[PDB]
Amino acid sequence: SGFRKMAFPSGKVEGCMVQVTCGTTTLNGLWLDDVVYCPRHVICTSEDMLNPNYEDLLIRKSNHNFLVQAGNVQLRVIGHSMQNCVLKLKVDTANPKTPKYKFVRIQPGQTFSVLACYNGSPSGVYQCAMRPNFTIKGSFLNGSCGSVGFNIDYDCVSFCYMHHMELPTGVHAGTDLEGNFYGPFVDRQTAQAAGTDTTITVNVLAWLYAAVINGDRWFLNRFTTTLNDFNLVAMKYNYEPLTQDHVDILGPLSAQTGIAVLDMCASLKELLQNGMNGRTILGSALLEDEFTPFDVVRQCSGVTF
């Protein structure tokens, strides 16, 4: 028992991280088979940033401009290509440690582990979620770019994110591994606002089930509610509307704990209307919406990879 924020192990992704230099700018890249992926903004200077034409900035580059270092091993680029906002670099050697893997585009609310890298070298690891505004509350210094977000399904590593930008708010935007941005963001140094950051209601609810399971259950309440009724109170506290599909998802928790979904929605509502009044749940003095149903399952079942 006990409950914490925890990431999948990094191990598998560590051996896919490489350093990529072009011009001066060096950042991180990801090496799978005979391809190294990275943010295309590696070809830009601090000036190009303000309004780059990537197509045209790229014509003036050739394979040999792109230095790719695997610790000390220098890989030869024998081809290159821009896919959306990523660059794909054909290289001579295939990665001996390439795991099973896939490129996924997660839905908002979905969580993933992030291995933060500086200069191809991984500095640390943490879990975060694709916030409803399509940002993420990460920790990314300069040099962090091209670091990635991933899930693991026993063997298979799912790549959901590649890091590109920081926003005025101290939050981050980035791409799937096909290089399309989550949200409306562009890889340019222009003014860009997040949008309204809402709470992932379904994830909050699971966090409650996890609480129950761990014998933090004081916030349980005799009241029940209806779906429509509860959403009225959600919308007003800026909570993502809750669908039938969200309830479905919370079924196995619901079953296990003996607490009906809507009774848990009742208990939540009263916490919105009445705050936490000082107390803590699982040590957190606020509500935590960066845990999927699945995350909770995993951690209250002890799954491995």
Ligand X SMILES: *[C@](O)(C(=O)NC)[C@@H](C[C@@H]1CCNC1=O)NC(=O)[C@H](CC1CC1)n1cccc(NC(=O)C(C)C)c1=O
Site string for ligand X, 37-66 (x = CB under 6 A): ----x-------x-----------------
Neighbours of 55 (CB within 10 A): 8
**Per CB under 8 A, which of residues 16..35 are in contact with its own copies?**
none
128, 95 in Cβ contact below 8 A?
Answer: no
Which secondary-structure segment (H or E) carries 254?
Answer: helix 244-257
Q: Which of 96, 70, 92 has the alpha carbon at shortest distance from 80?
A: 92
d(CA 69, CA 71): 6
Q: What minimum distance in Å lies between the beta carbon of 227 and its own copies?
A: 28
Q: Is 41 a catalytic residue?
A: yes
Residue facing ligand X at closest CB distance: 145
Neighbours of 191 (CB within 10 A): 6
Q: Which CB atom, from 79 or from 124, has the smaller least distance to its own copies?
A: 124
Asked if residue 145 binds ligand X (CB under 6 A), the reply is: yes
Q: Which of 216, 211, 218, 202 has the alpha carbon at shortest distance from 251?
A: 202
Q: Is 145 a catalytic residue?
A: yes
The residue within the footprint of ligand X, chosen from 65, 119, 123, 189 (CB under 6 A), is: 189
Q: Which of 152, 71, 82 has the alpha carbon at shortest distance from 117?
A: 71
Site string for its own copies, 197-226 (x = CB under 8 A): -----------------xx-----------
Q: Which CB atom, from 48 or from 263, has the smaller least distance to ligand X?
A: 48
Q: Which CB atom, from 131 or from 164, has the smaller least distance to ligand X?
A: 164
Q: What minimum distance in Å lies between the beta carbon of 225 and ligand X?
A: 34
Which secondary-structure segment (H or E) carries 162?
Answer: strand 156-167
DSSP secondary structure code for residue 180 in this structure: P
The residue within the footprint of ligand X, chosen from 168, 258, 278, 302 (CB under 6 A), is: 168
Q: At what angle do helices 261-274 and 201-213 cross, to 10 degrees?
A: 100
Asked if residue 140 binds ligand X (CB under 6 A), the reply is: yes
Q: Pick one of ligand X, its own copies, none as the site partner of residue 187 (Cβ within 5 to 8 A by kind).
A: ligand X
35, 75 in Cβ contact below 8 A?
Answer: no
Catalytic: which of 16, 38, 41, 160?
A: 41
Q: Which CB atom, from 47 or from 245, has the smaller least distance to ligand X?
A: 47
Q: What minimum distance in Å lies between the beta carbon of 168 and its own copies?
A: 10
d(CA 60, CA 303): 49
**Distance (Å) of CA 224 to CA 259, 265, 286:** 10, 7, 22
Q: Tokens 């959600």, residue?
A: 234
Q: Tokens 């821009």, residue?
A: 82
Asked if residue 170 binds its own copies (CB under 8 A), the reply is: yes
Q: Which CB atom, from 37 or from 140, has the smaller least distance to its own copies?
A: 140
Q: Which residues fall within 8 angstroms of residue 142, CB to CB, at 6 or more apart?
A: none
**Per CB under 8 A, which of residues 68..127 are in contact with its own copies?**
115-119, 121-126
| Site residues, ligand X (CB under 6 A) | 1, 27, 41, 49, 140-145, 164-168, 172, 187-189, 192
Active site residues: 41, 145
| Site residues, its own copies (CB under 8 A) | 1-11, 14-15, 115-119, 121-126, 128, 137-144, 166, 170-172, 214-215, 276, 280, 283-286, 298-305
